């Protein structure tokens with residue numbers, strides 16, 4: 001159980017945006033409000049649970065185009081709204097060419113690979129996210145953890161050298177492929193290359 005925390009995934013950033021001291025969910029970001037209204041609060045309480053029990057490392061030909069951010073709509077929860085092709089989702093501001101510290105939730109820890117992909121130049125978030133819009137840029141095998149599994153703020157951590165020559169909006173998609181299970185996790189992070 002986990003999705004990306006830095007650059008944060010849609011469900012993670014939306015749950016941070018909605019978080020209140022009583023546990024009520026009150027987002028101010030409009031894409032987050034829309035996703036709450038469509039798919040429900042359960043998605044944000046379970047922001048880490050974007051999973052397909054049977055994916056088994058499969059991607060194109062199995063996870064339909066336009067459904068990556070909800071694990072093909074095969075999870076135990078409704079994450080369908082987190083596929084909305086909108087440009088107003090919360091996003092992380094990045095510098096093209098910089099190496100950044102990546103954090104991925106270890107809400108429940110598992111052995112495996114993190115397959116990290118970046119949308120191609122020219123792709124923008126008002127378009128459908130398909131496999132042919134993504135390029136595999138890194139695979140991270142069994143990275144280390146900071147914080148115990150199931151504790152607030154706990155995460156896997158590794159470095160990512162961001163490609164040069166990029167600008168404007170993009171998305172980083174990660175597939176967490178367990179080595180001990182067919183269960184995989186699906187993570188989508190809105191970013192913009194406007195730094196430096």
Ligand SMILES: [Cu+2]
Pocket residue numbers: 001002108109110
């Ligand atoms: Cu898990």
